[PDB]
């Protein structure tokens, strides 16, 4: 059983978005479906609920009259037409059959433009040694940071993105390695910012 | 609207010990077919919620035997046999008897472990960053417990306020420790006007506060 | 796959 969402992303306030879900493996036409959202560090909040055929519909008074849930029982797809978008609609949107929840598509409602980050090394100093990288001034979320093309996973700590007063995001990713290892081993972090199509590989050297 | 009341909202628990999460329903959940549509979900950090228990007591595919569900009518409970390191996450109760499908506030389950002192590290800004007219001074607090820790920035012994932001990682699934990062943001001109850059660390696991410093200029 | 929602029992 799979639920793959699409159509999510950065949107202007007062704008429109339409989320799509490709439901697979379980006879989609037989069951009710829903759209549940989650704002940063918040709980589960239902957005819309449709029945098996599509004759019954429910929306809470937070999205009512602005959002529309729909379904194609022949194509095995679920839709959510979001209109008159507000900053309070910024959340991760999941498509759920209840027992199964998709990966969730992140929706951002902001007038701020897409910006790629600045990648700076957190150089090691003076048998455990700490080093990392600062991923500063990007919008919107998310970024992904891996070390040595995924080979280095042990002792890696990637910190949650903190919004700066400038309205741009920033975070740091750190890794603990033996000091012995330094002289030999080369340390490079792979920073990926899919929203702005930015890819940066930064060598962190003493 | 059928309102689910959860208790406790925060659940710190020792490894291998049992845990119980309470859930009250505002009305009856028994449907015409005889089944009461009350479920339990687990959401670990950065991932989608996963169904554990479905109709009061039945467990889902892949879900262990240690998880268990009980209750009838309004009162319900989710019990764990032995708390494992992989159980850290937010547990949700849910109702699917009536329209709309509702949820509880969520219970954060924490691992209560032995006190671990943090590893403190200070990183000076990069030379490349100084070109753009900004300097970022990062402080790393690695692998500590409890989560509560104080970080103070000192610039030539002068205490800093409102010019630093901190970030904490979620509880680890392997060693159950926390990691903290504090970043001091200063312009190139404000940065170049001072010598001493330190971060004072206060943690339960430290008998005395840990101070890590560097001089700008080497 | 389960009949998660009570509205689907009559289907």
Q: Considering the domain A1-111 in this protein, what is its CATH number?
A: 2.60.40.10
What does this entry list as its resolution, in Å? 2.4
Which among A1, A32, A56 is the nearest to C1, CB-wise?
A1
Q: A99: nearest CA in chain C?
A: C4
Round to whole Å and give the CA distance between B101 and A34.
Answer: 9
The yes-or-no answer to whether A1-111 and A112-206 have a common fold is yes
CB atoms within 10 A of CB B160: 16
Contact A134 B183 (CB under 8 A): yes
Q: Which residues pair with B42 in a beta bridge?
A: B50, B91
Q: Which residues pair with A4 in a beta bridge?
A: A22
Q: Considering the domain A112-206 in this protein, what is its CATH number?
A: 2.60.40.10
Round to whole Å and give the CA distance between A87 and B20.
Answer: 36
Q: Pairing state of beta strands A162-163 and A169-178?
A: antiparallel
Q: How far apart are the first and last CA of chain A?
A: 48
Place of tokens 């042990």: A154
* Cβ contact B141:B42 at 8 Å: no
Deposited experimental method: X-ray
Element containing residue A95 per DSSP (H, E): strand A91-96
Round to whole Å and give the CA distance between B70 and A92.
Answer: 31
Closest CA to A159 of B62, B154, B182: B182
Round to whole Å and give the CA distance between A115 and A193.
Answer: 9
Q: Which residues pair with B195 in a beta bridge?
A: none
Closest CA to B109 of B173, B163, B167: B173
Element containing residue B192 per DSSP (H, E): helix B188-192
* Cβ contact A85:A14 at 8 Å: yes
Q: Which domains does chain B have, with CATH numbers?
A: 1-112 (2.60.40.10), 113-216 (2.60.40.10)
Round to whole Å and give the CA distance between A203 and A187.
Answer: 6
Q: Measure C5 CA to nearest chain A CA, in Å.
A: 7
Q: Which of residues 1-11 of C touch B (CB under 8 A)?
A: 2, 4-7, 9
Domain segments of chain A as ranges: 1-111, 112-206
CB contact burial A189-203 (16+ within 10 A = b; e otherwise): bbbbbebbebebebe
Element containing residue B86 per DSSP (H, E): none
């Amino acid at each position: 059983v799979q639920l793959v969402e699409s159509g999510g992303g950065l949107v202007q306030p007062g704008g429109s978005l339409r989320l799509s879900c490709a439901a697979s493996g379980f006879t989609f036409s037989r069951y009710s479906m829903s759209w549940v959202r989650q704002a940063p560090g918040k709980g589960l909040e239902l957005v819309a609920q449709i029945n098996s055929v599509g004759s019954s519909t429910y929306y809470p008074d937070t999205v009512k009259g602005r959002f529309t849930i729909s379904r194609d029982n022949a194509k095995n797809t679920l839709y959510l037409q979001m209109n008159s978008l507000r900053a309070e609609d910024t959340a991760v949107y999941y498509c759920a059959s209840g027992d199964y929840w998709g990966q969730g598509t992140l929706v951002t409602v902001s007038s701020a433009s897409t910006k790629g980050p600045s990648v700076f090394p957190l150089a090691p100093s003076s048998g455990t040694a700490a080093l990392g990288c600062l991923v500063k001034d990007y919008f919107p979320e998310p970024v992904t940071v891996s070390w040595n093309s995924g080979a280095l996973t042990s002792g890696v700590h990637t910190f949650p993105a903190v919004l700066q007063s400038s309205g741009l995001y920033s975070l740091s990713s750190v890794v603990t390695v033996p000091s012995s290892s330094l002289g030999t081993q080369t340390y490079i972090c792979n920073v990926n910012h899919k929203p702005s199509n930015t890819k940066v590989d930064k060598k962190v050297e003493p | 609207d059928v309102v689910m009341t959860q208790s406790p909202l925060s659940l710190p628990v020792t490894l291998g010990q049992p845990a119980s999460i309470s859930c009250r329903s505002s009305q009856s959940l028994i449907y015409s077919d005889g089944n009461a549509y009350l479920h339990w979900f687990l959401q670990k950090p950065g991932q989608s919620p996963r169904l554990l228990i479905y109709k009061v007591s039945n467990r889902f595919s892949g879900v262990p035997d240690r998880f268990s569900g009980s209750g009838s009518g309004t009162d319900f409970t989710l019990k764990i046999s032995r708390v494992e390191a992989e159980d850290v996450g937010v547990y949700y109760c849910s109702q699917s008897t009536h329209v709309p499908w509702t949820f509880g506030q969520g219970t954060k389950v924490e691992i209560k472990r032995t006190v671990a002192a943090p590893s403190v590290f200070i990183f000076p800004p990069s030379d490349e960053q100084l070109k753009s007219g900004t300097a970022s001074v990062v402080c790393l607090l690695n692998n500590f417990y409890p989560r509560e820790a104080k970080v103070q920035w000192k610039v030539d012994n002068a205490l800093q306020s409102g010019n630093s932001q901190e970030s904490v990682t979620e509880q680890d699934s392997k060693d159950s420790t926390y990691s903290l990062s504090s970043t001091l943001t200063l312009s190139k001109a404000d940065y170049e006007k001072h010598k001493v850059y330190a971060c004072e660390v206060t943690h339960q696991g430290l008998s005395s506060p840990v101070t890590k410093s560097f001089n700008r200029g080497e | 796959k389960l009949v998660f929602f009570a509205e689907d029992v009559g289907s």
